């Protein structure tokens, strides 16, 4: 979902979904 966490510039986890 929007379970997406963005940890810094150009950096994420749980990108899908």
């Amino acid at each position: 979902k929007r379970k997406r966490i963005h940890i810094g510039p150009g950096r994420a986890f749980y990108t899908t979904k």
Epitope: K1, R2, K3, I5, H6, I7, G8, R11
Partner: antibody
Framework: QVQLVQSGAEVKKAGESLEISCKGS????????IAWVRQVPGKGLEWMGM????????RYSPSLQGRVTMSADKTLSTAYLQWSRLEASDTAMYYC???????????????????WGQGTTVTVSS | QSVLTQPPSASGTPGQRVTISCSGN????????VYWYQQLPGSTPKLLIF???QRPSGVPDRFSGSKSGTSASLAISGLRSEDEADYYC?????????????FGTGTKVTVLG
């Protein structure tokens, strides 16, 4: 009014099981991560890990021995910090915090612990 | 490892300005976002700044955040007796395959009386 409201003080003995809760309302609770933070009297803040109410995925702080766990009810929109067998050093203040912020220009931040609960104070005597 | 190092205490005269360091690693603060919290005696932590230097609406501009390299700073301008509290930094450590949150050791700010 987005709200995170916790369950309230518990005084216990070493070895007893315990649960504490954190109930989100006035938003879609199953949208955002909830985290748990511990603070021993006089010491500082420690990250315990987090739960995703959507699908109940969890991520635990590397030093959570495996006595302590997290759970989430989509029905009552509530999150739980759980213990099988309490010990003396579990004695602390426990806050819950939800991972989300929105500034007034509609911008959407997904990594920001803006909203916090009042804390649940937990005492364990050995 | 995984420990954000803060000076135990720091101080300022009223109306003056104090800063708190927050020192970490390449696994955390260097490339990852930073956040700051104020904790008044007896009370729930309040978020002061997010993503290095942005402050939520409702927060004065005398709280100011900076970061360069392996470390970061919280500037408190116009020092008031109500700023007297505990300050914690934080960010994400990725030493492991995921997003761990970590708080700094903590800094006690006293306003000289």
């Amino acid at each position: 009014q987005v709200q995170l409201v916790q369950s309230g003080a518990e005084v216990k003995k070493a070895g007893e099981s315990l649960e504490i809760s954190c109930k989100g309302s006035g938003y879609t609770f199953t949208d955002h991560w909830i985290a748990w933070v511990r603070q021993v009297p006089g010491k500082g803040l420690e990250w315990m890990g987090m739960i995703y109410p959507g699908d109940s995925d969890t991520r635990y702080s590397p030093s959570l021995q495996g006595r302590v766990t997290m759970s989430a009810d989509k029905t009552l929109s509530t999150a739980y910090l759980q213990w099988s067998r309490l010990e003396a050093s579990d004695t602390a203040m426990y806050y819950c915090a939800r991972l989300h912020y929105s500034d007034r220009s509609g911008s959407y931040f997904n990594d920001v612990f803006h909203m916090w609960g009042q804390g649940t104070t937990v005492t364990v005597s050995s | 490892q995984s420990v954000l190092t803060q000076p135990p205490s720091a101080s300022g005269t009223p109306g003056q300005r104090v800063t708190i360091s927050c020192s970490g690693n390449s696994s955390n603060i260097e490339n990852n976002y930073v956040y700051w919290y104020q904790q008044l005696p007896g009370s729930t932590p309040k978020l002061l700044i997010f993503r290095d230097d942005q402050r939520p609406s409702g927060v004065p501009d005398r709280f100011s955040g900076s970061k360069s390299g392996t470390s970061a700073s919280l500037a408190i301008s116009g020092l008031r007796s109500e700023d007297e509290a505990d300050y914690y930094c934080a960010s994400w450590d990725d030493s492991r395959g995921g997003p761990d949150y970590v708080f700094g050791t903590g800094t006690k700010v006293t306003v000289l009386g």
